[PDB]
Symmetry: D2
Subunit: 265 residues, 4 copies
């Protein structure tokens, strides 16, 4: 297995991509501490991976809860090799014009506290452990960190902010801790309480690869960055992992639909 003996801490790991990552990492022989809000989903995850996962109930916006998570990971598993700050909330792609005046302030805080501050706090909480292990941080970004229309101004700003975290923390924590970003997109899939695309169009206009991958197919990039001995030269790296959103064509996403007949293959 790719990650035998490795210890990772994954925030927002009780569901979504984060849970797919927990499952993958454990299958790869890793031990995994998860910080998330749902006590029930966390206990379910602990039992699913008996002895290879530990769940910490808490608020990713709270430095104290991030520190509780780091501490619990160290208590259960003895070290932290790879930190994966991953918890994020969306903004329904709500356009600036559609953000009501009486909710915009609250919404700003909700989404930024989770998507950016929670990442800052995760890294802050885990810094002693990561320096000790000469480990690494793998941020979950998004296509919204690079291109428009993957979210409203709030979500897009937060994910661009994370690209800034990749760069500044790769600098600040060098030479001791490496810091990289995976920017998934085109996956299967919740926004703040203050706020409230067809597959055909998705395959034709958005995704050159011509299909929406299952969540599990997005876990491999994180295994790569977490693998002992495969990512040593990488810091400040940004891996767009979104089906080709940034390289899509003007009239169609892909240019090569006819190749198989074109090449008589």
């Amino acid at each position: 297995m790719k990650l035998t003996g490795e210890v990772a801490l994954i925030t927002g790991g009780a569901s979504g991509l984060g849970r797919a990552l927990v499952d993958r990492f454990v299958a790869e022989g890793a031990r995994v501490a998860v910080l998330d809000k749902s006590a029930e989903r966390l206990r379910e995850l602990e039992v699913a991976h008996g002895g290879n996962a530990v769940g910490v109930v808490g608020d990713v916006r709270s430095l104290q809860d991030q520190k509780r998570a780091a501490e619990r990971c160290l208590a259960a598993f003895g070290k932290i090799d790879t930190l994966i700050p991953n918890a994020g909330i969306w903004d329904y792609s709500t356009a600036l014009a559609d953000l009501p005046e009486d909710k915009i302030d609250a919404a700003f805080d909700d989404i930024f506290h989770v998507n950016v501050k929670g990442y800052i706090h995760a890294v802050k909480a885990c810094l002693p452990a990561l320096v000790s292990s000469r480990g690494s941080v793998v941020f979950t970004i998004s296509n919204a960190g690079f291109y428009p229309n993957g979210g409203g101004p709030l979500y897009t700003a937060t994910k661009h902010a994370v690209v800034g975290l990749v760069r500044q923390m790769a600098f600040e924590l060098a030479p001791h801790v490496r810091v990289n970003g995976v920017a998934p997109g085109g996956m299967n899939t919740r926004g703040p309480s203050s706020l409230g695309v067809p597959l055909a169009d998705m395959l034709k206009s958005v995704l050159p690869i011509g299909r929406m991958p299952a969540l599990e197919e997005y876990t491999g990039a994180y295994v790569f960055f977490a693998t002992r001995g495969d990512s040593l030269p990488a810091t400040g790296a940004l891996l767009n992992y979104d089906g080709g959103m940034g390289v899509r064509g003007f009239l169609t996403a892909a240019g090569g639909a006819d190749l198989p007949e074109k090449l008589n293959i």
Copy 2:
């Protein structure tokens, strides 16, 4: 005079680069409304430019104050052609490890509310006027929106966020309103930080930082904004990001500039 008849609103326009922009825009024949926290400095520019600049004291973090700045601009000059969200605060380049646990949450809010939310609220406030005029938004970013070591994680993350606002708002406001970013660097402004946060002068590290090999006066950074404010010149530009930082992103490994030996190598 390249901006005759045009009207700009500039946030943080009473000091630093913002004030240089006010003077340049008035000099180019624009009328300018300014939102800023300094009453004294708003008075100074009002006296300097007479009726061609109007100031409004307020907090860039407040949508209400942003709406009052827009309302005032409309009352004074009848339209808004170019909005320059420009007000920003620094973080003293405070490293993550150096952000104290009891100050970090407040510092986050202070810097994000000014640098990111205040940009959002300025556009929100001016959107009706800007759609009416088929106008422009020129965001002030920073070298810190592209490269590390121009601020700590808080500042660097805010200016990266502003790059996101250029991209997303260029998309959301098209085809009516053009949205672009200028990213100044090497300005040597007095980088004010938040009260919650309690380094090497530019001159002292110049040859490690700026390929241009010199420290531009503030006036030297106003030309990029005039370009984006000039409808006959910048019509194709939206979603553009203009690094304007003396070459920080193209600096060499051992020294910033590669052409120290150029003139002797070519004689003359």
Copy 3:
């Protein structure tokens, strides 16, 4: 006028964007030396701008012809302030699969010699003059220098290559000569002899600005970079000038078609 007393040298200035630039620069009070292949179109341009333009007949692929151009500019006008290497040929957006085996080598040379080598030679020829004047270089790139589907692999590679020239030459020629790039796209409009989009689709899917600007509307960015006192802090700068191609949405180019009604404005 914006450019009074300034001297520019523009390669590929006899037609297309290059001619629009000649015309604009002269209107702005600049003196302009033009290197191009057509003797007739050059003489026509000289007479159009009597005393403010000089035409040098030559091959942009030839260092000796680029040097002849620099020399003629100096002879006529006394200095070179701004060099604008701009001559380029297209590849018909010919896909790799459609490039015939017996023409690909020749085509590679044709397009690279013009689009990249001609730029290298222009800068090389003008280097003494530009260092003397503490001037600048403004490369014509293309949206093809940043995104796919603005050309085939040949044209796209050449224009990405030019981005490399912007970066390396901004470095190499600092602190004496500044080097920046304008990347136009969405304009009105020839490829190599070895080789051989609807407006509705262009406005809806490609161009957020929702219209194809006239060539003259692409000249302003070059005036900016050539203006004495407006671009001093800029070197290694890249100005995407393509109607928003890089910031286009997934299902439509623009997100704000409804704003005027939405805002009751």
Copy 4:
């Protein structure tokens, strides 16, 4: 073994990073065809890996030789899953002013034919096989494809060109074939240049260049390529660009790394 049953073709695979890739891919259970100019070194890897690696002597600039390498791969192993166009030559970091007028045209062709055209011809040669296998192209770029001072204008322009090939070919080959770039830096390979062209060792400038603060062994750069060759792990990736250069693009102004004082600051 992460690549059991897969077949790779690697150009320039008989030395440097290319040979490290061959060894890693065989170690991961792939079979590998190599196109390279060194007959001796192709023999060395053939003996090393027995029947799991086959070499073909040839010129990466020649489409004919690229087609012969593909044909050979097919004859040996029955398919091509991953193509790694990797062969490149450097330019001694020769500055523009230092390119002699009588050598510059030849140098241009030599470096562009190898670094750019040879990449084009490798994909052209392997396209039928890659479309058949719904395979992958992993281009070797360089830090010189993103930042200055990693080569002269010739090399820097070629590796920037290769970034264009990642983008354009990701588009043209979708949805069947995925195309991505790895951009290694800090490798300390013996950067061979063209005969037409007649500097500071990495170790000597490390703290101005590499935030990671150490000089990776060649084997350390093979992991990114394995990832792109692993169908179960990299399926969503196309058009991606992975800088793999010890942090060259996130290096600080005064020193490459920002965390010299980190461990003392946190105790333990």
